[PDB]
A paper describes a structure:
Several X-ray structures of FDHs have been solved which showed that all FDHs have two separated binding sites.
Heterogeneity of the flavin binding loop conformation was found, shown as “loose conformation” observed in Chain A, “tight conformation” observed in Chain B of the Thal:FADH− complex, and “open conformation” observed in Chain A of the Thal:FAD:AMP complex (more details and description are provided in Fig. S21). Analysis of these structures indicates that different conformations accommodate different arrangements of water molecules in the active site. To elucidate how protein dynamics can affect water arrangement in the active site of Thal, the open conformation was selected as a starting model for MD simulations. No water molecule is located above the C4a position of the isoalloxazine ring. As water networks in Thal connect the isoalloxazine ring of the flavin to outside bulk solvents, we propose that these water networks are important for providing a proton for the PCET process to stabilize formation of C4aOOH-FAD in the Thal reaction.
Residue numbers in the entry:
A (entry chain A): -8 to 448, 454 to 531
B (entry chain B): 2 to 449, 456 to 531
């Protein structure tokens, strides 16, 4: 019945981790595992210079510093300075409610206001344990305000309208934000960090064969040059082709193109006159006839790309509309054309093969969840990091975290499409026939009764976030943005005169703060120039 | 105006007056609240224990400072449940038996937060050493300063009333009910009707419209809260909502209880609830100034009332016939639905488990919190009702499963009761958590209001380690990540030394619980 200590070592650890791929997923994995495993494991990154990375992935969500760069011990300003980073206070939705061609300029709604709505990262304040969203919704439904949700509930909206920064020049925080950054530069930065600070071995070669033992565990990757890179654990960061998880380990990908329709992008970088126009401290999502277009500003240039369904537009149609949007020469612009899959691996980790980044789960880039899926998956791999016994429970629990995180974001993205009121194109009409997951259906039913959807709540904190990342405030942004309202106000508010009065002060606070900050904050342009030392 | 105009609460006691006080506060004089409570004078001296969120989730909403309510119900401090003789055979004793290693058969379930190193809780660094042969120390002693404090009977606050540790409360239930009744009536304009309900009036849609009283008064209402206790006069009897008997999860179904005068001068006051294993259940000890509440919780399938009574008496050396005993037969389980139509059940009327981890009051204020969140209008939106019910089910089943683990993993085989616990099917949720635990992974890492979210997964990693590791269930192997983390292991060694030192530092400088209570209660 007594505890029996396990033998005097006998070392049963993983000795070598091989990472296939040198995109952001590859080098993020290499940097983080390098930090996590304290020089007890050899880490090798195998990447083919000859096979281009996806060349996109430039907007983020606000937990990137807390969940990833903080673990590496890299302060915010330091990495920002190496990847021409900028500030993202929101995704701003343009022309999602009105029909017609793609235009960067908002059309006019029937109410006279521009067809824009923001999804900011600011926390919503509460009165009497009820978020400001609900007091707004009550007023809107009771015919007591005409005001838009984003305008009433976040000072951030005013700040973004004026293109001011989320920090003062003394670098005091004015609001919550996430980042824009140059994806190529981030990767190079993390590669240099991994190689020079975390002892990672960088092999520049192309995998041509995955070698397995009799039990079907990977033992090595054979390369075109004739190398055999032996390893105990393999991380598939090969991108969409999923060379280890899908091809060698034969793990099915779960196609969820019945949930979300976009599957293609045409992308480019657009030089930009920041002196003239300033810099928008937000990502724009510009609705198109057969999808949408991102705009991701940084100093000197904006990343842009038209995400579309190739069932509803050809590459040429897409490229034409994308080119017209910015006045690009279609014969003279350098376009990156990509096909993406939508869904997840049945299991993200099988045998000794862990998928991370585009080789694992993906939804379209509309709320910038790709990089988030990488560092969340990496965090979870470190937490469930195996030895050579590969305990099936570690594997299972990792897989369950990936599933939950994926499902949580998929729900949120489904909300963007299924409640669009556009019916002008086959694409917008097909988004009203989506296969809706039970869990988003349940959330909509909760929202429609006037109740909060996932009220908000430190590593225990940020990691729990992965299972329920998109909170009440974000759901209000998108539902209320698109025009979906509760059937009626939250009934409890009808009994709470004092609480309603309290929220009136919160509403007045949003106005006052917005006004103060628009006056006092620097332009995004001026703050970037200070930060990056271009002045 | 489709709002609720009148809420009628059937029953007083803690459930009724907690509901009245909180809804009084929540509804801002926009609703008439009535409590219908049978005179039933003879309220005794019933010790009850709680969990740490009582102040933040309940009294803070009412605007009542901790010390104010404590001074009105002879409250004391609970830093843990201490489990005595849960691992060794024989008759009850207040004194712990010796395990084979020479340690007392004691283990604590404190409310302290476990520190972490490198995003890994201390529990896991302890488990690794324990499994690897490198420490003989018990989890509670290694990982909580609180254990040293409780062993010395020191208080969770300094005399200046600054905090040393997390804690919950002991209190006299009758007195808290009186305090709350006075608050509800005098400050929140609740009406106290002292009468017996004789009839529940319902319409053809099965909605309650009024309660008729013995005096002849008809109490019309729009929403009815059933705080009538185990009889569930509204939810079960009038609405015919079925009760789900969960005696296939937990065997205890009865209690015999008394209040025991205590010599605080001689013995000090323990800042914890004791859970003292018996042949056919367990006995609680809930100290307050001058007396401890005590109750033998038992299965009447394994002991008769008389047998339990005698064993209870023997435990404390009481004269059976010269002792005032309260006997109760419990209902263990929950309603199929807590809220049906315009009837919301709260307290024993809704759900119940034995007080092994002090769940009773928690289920009340969680339900109240959720009713005010989901508070309806006269349309009774079925979504509001459904979401309430979901919260209740999940909160209840979660606690029921935590409790089942206390019994399922006891190594005792000495009596039919202790063998019978291991013949029950282990709940699915605990099967899952045990599997997670046995791989060396954390179980429900803590998140720190959405102290609201606390209700859905209330018991966190520290609490599962306390019960599993306390009873002798260990992980199969250390967390594998630890073998790759020499620097983190070194960091955790500093944390273990930190715990030992807090223990010594605090034990030296804290007041006795007795001395702190005498100051708090203004004894002279
Ligand atoms: C259009 C689009 C827009 C997106 N926008 C965003 C956004 O705004 N925000 C966000 O957070 N995420 C976004 N994402 C997701 C994001 O791009 C990715 O998560 C991120 O770039 C990581 O990609 P990856 O490293 O998994 O794959 P890739 O960049 O495809 O890299 C794969 C690597 O595998 C290597 N490889 C392949 N085969 C071999 C072989 N045989 N031998 C050796 N090496 C090999 C390749 O050479 C390459 O180095 C977007 C995705 C798409 C498609
Ligand atoms: N028929 C009744 N009329 C009024 N109050 C009642 C009735 N039955 C029980 N109660 C009350 O419900 C509360 C809880 O009851 P119990 O838990 O059975 O002591 C007490 O305040 C009882 O007096």
């Amino acid at each position: 019945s007594g505890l029996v200590p396990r033998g005097s070592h006998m070392d049963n650890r993983i000795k070598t981790v091989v990472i296939l791929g040198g995109g952001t997923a590859g080098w993020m994995t290499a940097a983080y595992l390098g930090k996590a495993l304290q020089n007890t494991v050899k880490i090798v990154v195998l990447e083919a210079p000859t096979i281009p990375r996806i060349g996109v992935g430039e907007a983020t969500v606000p937990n990137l510093q807390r969940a990833f760069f903080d673990y590496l011990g890299i302060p915010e300003e330091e990495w920002m300075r190496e990847c021409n980073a900028s500030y993202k206070m929101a995704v701003k939705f343009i022309n999602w409610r009105t029909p017609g061609e793609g235009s960067p300029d908002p059309r006019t709604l029937d109410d006279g206001h521009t067809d824009t709505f923001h999804h900011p990262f600011g926390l919503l304040p509460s009165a009497d344990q009820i978020p400001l969203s609900h007091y707004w919704a009550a007023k809107r439904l009771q015919g007591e305000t005409d005001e838009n949700f984003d305008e009433a509930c976040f000072a951030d909206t005013a700040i973004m309208n004026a293109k001011k920064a989320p920090r003062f020049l003394d670098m005091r925080r004015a609001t919550n934000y996430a980042w824009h950054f140059d994806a190529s530069k981030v990767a190079a930065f993390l590669r240099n960090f991994a190689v020079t600070k975390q002892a990672v071995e960088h092999v520049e070669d192309e995998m041509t064969e995955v070698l397995t033992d009799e039990r079907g565990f990977i033992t090595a990757l054979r390369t075109k040059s004739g190398r055999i890179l032996q390893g105990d654990l393999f991380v598939d960061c090969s991108g969409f082709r999923g060379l280890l998880i899908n091809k060698a380990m034969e793990e099915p990908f779960i196609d969820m193109s019945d949930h979300l329709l976009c599957n293609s992008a045409v992308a480019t970088a657009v030089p930009h006159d920041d002196e003239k126009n300033g810099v928008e401290p937000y990502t724009s999502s510009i609705a198109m006839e057969a999808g949408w277009t991102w705009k991701i500003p940084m100093l000197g240039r904006f990343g842009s790309g038209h995400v579309y369904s190739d069932h509803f537009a050809t590459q040429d149609e897409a490229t034409l509309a994308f080119s017209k949007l910015w006045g690009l020469d279609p014969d003279n612009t350098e376009f990156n054309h990509v096909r993406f899959r939508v869904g997840r691996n049945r299991r993200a980790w099988v045998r000794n093969c862990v998928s991370v980044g585009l080789a694992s789960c993906f939804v379209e880039p509309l709320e910038s969840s790709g990089i988030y899926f990488i560092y969340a998956a990496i965090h979870m791999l470190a937490k469930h990091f195996p030895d050579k016994t590969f305990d099936k429970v570690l594997v299972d629990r990792f897989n369950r975290e990936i599933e939950e995180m994926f499902d949580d974001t998929r729900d949120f993205l489904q909300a963007h499409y299924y409640f669009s009121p556009r019916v002008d194109t086959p694409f917008w009409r097909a988004n009203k026939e989506l296969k809706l997951a039970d869990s988003i259906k349940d959330k909509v039913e909760t929202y429609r009764a006037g109740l909060p959807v996932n009220l908000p709540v430190y590593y225990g904190n940020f990691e729990a976030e992965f299972r329920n990342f998109w909170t009440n405030g974000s759901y209000y942004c998108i539902f209320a943005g698109l025009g979906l309202m509760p059937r009626n106000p939250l009934p409890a508010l009808a009994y709470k005169p004092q609480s309603i009065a309290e929220a009136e002060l919160l509403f007045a606070d949003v106005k006052r703060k917005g006004d103060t900050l628009v006056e006092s904050l620097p332009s995004t342009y001026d703050l970037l120039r200070q930060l990056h030392g271009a002045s």
